[PDB]
Amino acid sequence: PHMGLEEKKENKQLTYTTVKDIGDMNPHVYGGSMSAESMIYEPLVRNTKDGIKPLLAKKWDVSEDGKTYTFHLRDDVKFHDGTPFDADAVKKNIDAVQENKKLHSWLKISTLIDNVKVKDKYTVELNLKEAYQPALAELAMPRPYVFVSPKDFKNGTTKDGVKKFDGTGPFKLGEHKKDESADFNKNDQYWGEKSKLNKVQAKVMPAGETAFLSMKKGETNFAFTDDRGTDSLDKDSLKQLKDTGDYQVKRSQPMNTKMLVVNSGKKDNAVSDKTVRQAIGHMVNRDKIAKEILDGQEKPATQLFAKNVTDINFDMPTRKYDLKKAESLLDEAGWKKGKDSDVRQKDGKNLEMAMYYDKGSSSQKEQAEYLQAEFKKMGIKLNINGETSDKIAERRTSGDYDLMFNQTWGLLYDPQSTIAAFKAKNGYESATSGIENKDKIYNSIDDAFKIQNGKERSDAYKNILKQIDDEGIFIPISHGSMTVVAPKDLEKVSFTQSQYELPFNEMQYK
Numbered sequence: 001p002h003m004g005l006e007e008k009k010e011n012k013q014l015t016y017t018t019v020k021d022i023g024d025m026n027p028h029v030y031g032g033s034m035s036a037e038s039m040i041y042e043p044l045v046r047n048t049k050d051g052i053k054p055l056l057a058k059k060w061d062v063s064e065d066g067k068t069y070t071f072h073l074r075d076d077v078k079f080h081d082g083t084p085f086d087a088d089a090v091k092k093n094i095d096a097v098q099e100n101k102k103l104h105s106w107l108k109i110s111t112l113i114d115n116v117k118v119k120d121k122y123t124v125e126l127n128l129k130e131a132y133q134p135a136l137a138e139l140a141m142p143r144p145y146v147f148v149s150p151k152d153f154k155n156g157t158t159k160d161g162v163k164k165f166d167g168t169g170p171f172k173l174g175e176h177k178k179d180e181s182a183d184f185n186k187n188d189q190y191w192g193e194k195s196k197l198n199k200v201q202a203k204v205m206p207a208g209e210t211a212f213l214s215m216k217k218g219e220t221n222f223a224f225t226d227d228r229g230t231d232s233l234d235k236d237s238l239k240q241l242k243d244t245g246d247y248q249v250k251r252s253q254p255m256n257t258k259m260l261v262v263n264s265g266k267k268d269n270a271v272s273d274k275t276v277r278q279a280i281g282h283m284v285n286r287d288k289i290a291k292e293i294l295d296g297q298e299k300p301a302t303q304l305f306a307k308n309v310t311d312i313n314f315d316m317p318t319r320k321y322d323l324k325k326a327e328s329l330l331d332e333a334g335w336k337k338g339k340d341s342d343v344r345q346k347d348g349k350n351l352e353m354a355m356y357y358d359k360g361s362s363s364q365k366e367q368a369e370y371l372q373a374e375f376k377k378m379g380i381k382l383n384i385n386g387e388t389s390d391k392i393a394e395r396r397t398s399g400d401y402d403l404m405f406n407q408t409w410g411l412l413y414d415p416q417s418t419i420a421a422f423k424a425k426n427g428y429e430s431a432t433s434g435i436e437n438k439d440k441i442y443n444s445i446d447d448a449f450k451i452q453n454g455k456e457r458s459d460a461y462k463n464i465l466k467q468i469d470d471e472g473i474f475i476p477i478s479h480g481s482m483t484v485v486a487p488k489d490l491e492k493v494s495f496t497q498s499q500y501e502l503p504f505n506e507m508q509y510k
């Protein structure tokens, strides 16, 4: 371990282990690694524990009617190709985003942006259809309203890709070898807090033994939970790495709910039947999962968004583990047992379903194997399939799945953006599409977001989530945190409100 660690400390470098590549680094679409994109691209403002703060915009005014935001931009910023950041760059970026506004409909501000006007070189005006108090908060998201050099647009937009990946941030993208590595090099010209690290490299490899050995030999010296929730090192690997004396391990506050998604819209499978979904709701021993399978590292989750989360001020416990209840519900549904078979049948077909998990996640894999044994006791043939997180996301979008592991979006998004995503193609619309009352639930979601009083908004969320919970679309399991393994002599590793970034430009000493 020491040899590789010492070289990297000398070079002021981190090389992090990850199971997936950085993907499409165009931050106006959603495929690219979120933490990589937060290292190189920046929004107008930042959303912190202490609310909205200046970033590329120094200051802003809102009009009396709430419909015009004027942003007074820093005048000392360049993109990484040396081109200038100014009001025209802001306008061309926001306008490029708005050409693809169907992709961004999960974020309400995209449905309100009317136009953008350059008032002068460092002042830009954003006009909305109506007042919208969360505007600043949404403009603070790491996608899509962050700024790419206009020299990198293709055919006058970003909608079909970008030529290179120039932003304003503390790192710039260097060499990328597809499915192997990507370099984030110190931006020596950065307008703000300059990086104390010269290089962060993302090194792509499988999890399990190979990530562990890589970390143990100091070929990699850093790990963190990726944007899909996967930790490359299990609990025994973290223990052994700490036991070397060379690594430290840090863990954030609880940030999310990890859940099973049940596809109501999958017409060709039993999960499209509500009664079967309810049965499945009783087949998930979340207390045992959290205590025995996740080794007590995560608390069990009995609802989608914990009572402590913004605008959720209620306790609404979900279906409990109860295999007898499961069995009578399957019987009610016509899936009958016995007759010399383990598998339940209805009209002479066996009850089969396919569950999908991230093969890079040992904890997802272990839960999936447990649930396969449990489903077997109930007379379900569960076929489990470990896939890339990329391929899991594609199924979430298309609807090609019966059940999948997933997780909510964390402190900046839960509950409001995650609930919006219940009817978004690139969110969980697949899973909610088969609910009988979906028109009204969807309209309730639209309406909840108009309610200004926080207590009433909270009530509107409760009525939505009660009906989502009755449908058995989401089975909460545990609360996830972010975990970071880093060299023991690396100082200043800390967490933001997000599960999708780290302050790489503040970390130092190695």
Ligand SMILES: C[C@H](N[C@@H](CCN[C@H](Cc1c[nH]cn1)C(=O)O)C(=O)O)C(=O)O
Pocket (backbone or CB within 6 Å): 030, 031, 032, 034, 106, 143, 227, 228, 409, 413, 426, 427
């Ligand atoms: C818009 C929607 N999700 C948001 C925020 C939530 N991100 C997580 C994690 C993720 C990783 N890569 C893409 N999304 C999710 O969609 O489950 C975004 O990607 O910026 C999406 O992925 O299309």
Ligand code: NI
Pocket (backbone or CB within 6 Å): 030
């Ligand atoms: Ni996403």
